[PDB]
C-alpha cells in the first residue's frame, strides 16, 4: 500500500518543478535577441576530402593542436589523419569490426575505441618501436559502448548502452565511479570546458547532468520528444545543445533548468546525428539524415547555410579547438573538411 | 627543415596505403552475416557447431569466407544497434517454434526499417519437430491464437514434402504464408526473403545460407546493370 503515496509524491514534486520553472521564466531568448544584427548568408566549401576508409564512419574527434584527427569505421581500422596534408599518420587494425566510437586524448598520447563488444580499448601512440598495440582493455560494461571521452591520461569516461555511465582509470582496469539513473540507451556525451561536469543524452528524451567528483546527477532537463542522439556543451560551459530523431535542435541552460530555444524547419524531418558548436557559439552545426548538414544561428534560430557534400547520411562532425575548420563524416567512407 | 619530415610522411602514407589495399583485398573476399532471433529458438545449437558483446564465427564453404556475427549479449532494445548491420550480405533469422506474434512483429520492424531496406534476410523455421508434436498432441490450438488457420488452404500447388502428418504441413505453410504476407506487403523490390524449413540437427543449414547468399549476390549484380 506504499506505491500510491510514492506516486503522489513524485507527481507533486513534478508539479513543483513545473511551477518553479514557470516562475523563473519571464521572456524567451528570441525576444531579447532580435535587436542584434543577423549573421547573414555564409558558405564554406570542402577544402580537403579524405579517402581510404572501407566502411561507414561513425565517430571522430579533433585533436587539441588542430593537426591530427582519428576516425573509426566498420572495417576494424583506426586512422589518424593529418588535416593539412591528407596524410595517414597511423593505421591501427582493430580486433573488433563493429567499433561505434573513438576519442583523442588531450595530450595526444592515447586513443580510445568502443563498439558492439562492451570493451573500451586504449592504444599507445607515443611509443616508437615499430609496433602500436592496445595498452589497456576496459571490461565490465553490459550494454554496447556508444561514446567515450578522455578526461586525462589516467581517467576516461565511457557511456554504455545499459543506461549506465562509468568513470574508468587506466593502468588499473576497474571502475572508479558509476553514474546511474537513466532509463534509455546513452547515445552521446560531452565534457565541460573545466573538465568537472558532463552531460549525457539517453534514449528517454532527456539530458542529465552528472558530477564526476562525487558521482550523482545534479539537474534533469527533459524537453524533448524522442531519443537524443548527440549532445555538446556551449563554449561558455553554462549551456549545451541536443539533437534528437524528431528533427529538432534544442539549447538548454545549466542555470535556468529549462530549454531556451528550438531549432527546426517544416520542410525537413531527419534525425540529427551530431551537434557541435563554433568558437563563439553563434553557429550551431548539426548533422541530419537527409545527406547534408545545416548551420543554424544559435541566437536567432535562423538557418545561415547548407553543407551538402556527402553522398550518404552524416553520422559524425566536430569543430576543432581553435575553430579554424569543421570536419563532418558520413556513411560513404568519405571524410571532408569544411572551412 | 621540412623536406625530411615531408619525405617521411610520404613514405609512411605509402606504406599505410599498401597495407590498406591488402586489407581491402582481404576484406572484400568475405561476406558478413548477422544471426538474429528470439530466445529459445535453437540458434545456440548452430552457434556451438562453429560475457562479450559479439561472438565471431569464422566458417568457410566452397572456398568462400563467411563471417557470422551473433549479437546476443546486447540489451533487448535493438533500435540503436540494428542500424550497424546495413552492409551485411544477409541477416539470418531464427524463429522459435504467443511466441510467434513477437517474432512476426520483430520481422515486420526489421523489414520496413529505413536503414535495413537494402539488406535481405534469411528465414529459418527452427524446431519443426516441436511444431509437429504440438499439433499432433492436441493439447494446444492455433485457432485461438490465429483466427485464420481453419479457412486457410494448404498450397498443394507447391508443397513437395516427404511423408508426414498433412496437418503439420498445413501449419508450416501457414506460418510461411504469414511471414510472406508481411514480407511482400510493403516490399519495393530492393530486398527479399528466403524462407527455409530446418530442424535443430540439420547439417545442410550452411549449404542453404550459401545458396541464399549466392542468390542475393546474383540479384544485386543483375540490378547493378539495370537488368532487374
Amino acid at each position, epitope marked *: 500500500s506504499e506505491l500510491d503515496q510514492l506516486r503522489q509524491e513524485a507527481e507533486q514534486l513534478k508539479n513543483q518543478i513545473r511551477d518553479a520553472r514557470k516562475a523563473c521564466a519571464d521572456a524567451t531568448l528570441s525576444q531579447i535577441t532580435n535587436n542584434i544584427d543577423p549573421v547573414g548568408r555564409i558558405q564554406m566549401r570542402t577544402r580537403r576530402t579524405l579517402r581510404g576508409h572501407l566502411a561507414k564512419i561513425y565517430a571522430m574527434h579533433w585533436g587539441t593542436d588542430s593537426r591530427l584527427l582519428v576516425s573509426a569505421s566498420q572495417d576494424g581500422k583506426l586512422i589518424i589523419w593529418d588535416s593539412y596534408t591528407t596524410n595517414k599518420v597511423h593505421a591501427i587494425p582493430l580486433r573488433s569490426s563493429w567499433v561505434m566510437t573513438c576519442a583523442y586524448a588531450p595530450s595526444g598520447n592515447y586513443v580510445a575505441c568502443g563498439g558492439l563488444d562492451n570493451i573500451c580499448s586504449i592504444y599507445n601512440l607515443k611509443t616508437r618501436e615499430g609496433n602500436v598495440r592496445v595498452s589497456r582493455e576496459l571490461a565490465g560494461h553490459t550494454g554496447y559502448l556508444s561514446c567515450c571521452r578522455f578526461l586525462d591520461d589516467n581517467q576516461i569516461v565511457t557511456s554504455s548502452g545499459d543506461t549506465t555511465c562509468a568513470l574508468w582509470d587506466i593502468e588499473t582496469g576497474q571502475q572508479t565511479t558509476t553514474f546511474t539513473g537513466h532509463t534509455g540507451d546513452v547515445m552521446s556525451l560531452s565534457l565541460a570546458p573545466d573538465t568537472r561536469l558532463f552531460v549525457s543524452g539517453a534514449c528517454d*528524451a532527456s539530458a542529465k547532468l552528472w558530477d564526476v567528483r562525487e558521482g550523482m546527477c545534479r539537474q534533469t532537463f527533459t524537453g524533448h520528444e524522442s531519443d537524443i542522439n548527440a549532445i555538446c556543451f556551449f563554449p561558455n560551459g553554462n549551456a549545451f545543445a541536443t539533437g534528437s530523431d524528431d528533427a529538432t535542435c534544442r539549447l538548454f541552460d545549466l542555470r535556468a533548468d529549462q530549454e531556451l530555444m528550438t531549432y527546426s524547419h517544416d520542410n525537413i*524531418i531527419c534525425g540529427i546525428t551530431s551537434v557541435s558548436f563554433s568558437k563563439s557559439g553563434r553557429l550551431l552545426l548539426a548533422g541530419y539524415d537527409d545527406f547534408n548538414c545545416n548551420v543554424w544561428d544559435a541566437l536567432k534560430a535562423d538557418r545561415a547555410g547548407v553543407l551538402a557534400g556527402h553522398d550518404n547520411r552524416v553520422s559524425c562532425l566536430g569543430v576543432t579547438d581553435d575553430g579554424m575548420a569543421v570536419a563532418t563524416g558520413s556513411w560513404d567512407s568519405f571524410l571532408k573538411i569544411w572551412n | 627543415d621540412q623536406r625530411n619530415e615531408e619525405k617521411a610522411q610520404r613514405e609512411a602514407n605509402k606504406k599505410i596505403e599498401k597495407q590498406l589495399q591488402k586489407d581491402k583485398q582481404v576484406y572484400r573476399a568475405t561476406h558478413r552475416l548477422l544471426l538474429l532471433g528470439a530466445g529459445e529458438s535453437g540458434k545456440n545449437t548452430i552457434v556451438k557447431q562453429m560475457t562479450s558483446g559479439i561472438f565471431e564465427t569464422k566458417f568457410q564453404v566452397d572456398k568462400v569466407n563467411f563471417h557470422m556475427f551473433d549479437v546476443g549479449a546486447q540489451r533487448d532494445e535493438r533500435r540503436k544497434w540494428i542500424q550497424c548491420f546495413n552492409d551485411v550480405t544477409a541477416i539470418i533469422f531464427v524463429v522459435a517454434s504467443n511466441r510467434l506474434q513477437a517474432a512476426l512483429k520483430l520481422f515486420d520492424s526489421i523489414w520496413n526499417n529505413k536503414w535495413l531496406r537494402d539488406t535481405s534476410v534469411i528465414l529459418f523455421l527452427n524446431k519443426q519437430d516441436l511444431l509437429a508434436e504440438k499439433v499432433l498432441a492436441g493439447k494446444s490450438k492455433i485457432e485461438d*491464437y490465429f483466427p485464420e488457420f481453419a479457412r486457410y488452404t494448404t498450397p498443394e500447388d507447391a508443397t513437395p514434402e516427404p511423408g508426414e502428418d498433412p496437418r503439420v504441413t498445413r501449419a508450416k505453410y501457414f506460418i510461411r504464408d504469414e511471414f510472406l504476407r508481411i514480407s511482400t506487403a510493403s516490399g519495393d523490390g530492393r530486398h527479399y526473403c528466403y524462407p527455409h524449413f530446418t530442424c535443430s540437427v540439420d547439417t545442410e543449414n550452411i549449404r542453404r545460407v550459401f545458396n541464399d547468399c549466392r542468390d542475393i549476390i546474383q540479384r544485386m549484380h543483375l540490378r547493378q546493370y539495370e537488368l532487374l
Partner: nanobody
Amino acid sequence: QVQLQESGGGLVQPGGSLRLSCAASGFTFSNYKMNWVRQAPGKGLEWVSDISQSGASISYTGSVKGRFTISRDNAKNTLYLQMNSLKPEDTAVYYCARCPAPFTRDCFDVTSTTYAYRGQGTQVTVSS
C-alpha cells in the same frame, strides 16, 4: 516530457464491456504511431494492437482479432481501445506505448521490458 496515463479497468463479470482512454501530452500526437501492450500476470510481455498515423492501417494480434476495436484522433490527442467479449484468459495489465520515431513505420522495441515512453498502465481484470 511525454506522459501517458491510463483510465478505466475494474473488477467486472466476464463478457462485459469496459473502456480505456489515454490522453497524450508532452508531444505531438499526429506524427507518432501508437501500439497497445498487455502484461499477462505470471508471464512475459505481449503485444495487443497498433494503429497507423491518422487511422490508416489497423492490425491486431490473433488472440484478439475480430473482437477488439481501436480508435485514435489527432485533434483530441487521445487513444481509445474498445473492451468487449471479456474472458478470464484476457486478464492482463494494458499499457499505452508510443512509437520511438516520427514518420516511421518500423517502430522497434515496443515489447522491450524497460521502455521510457510506455504509459503507466491500469489493471484490467475480470472475475466473479
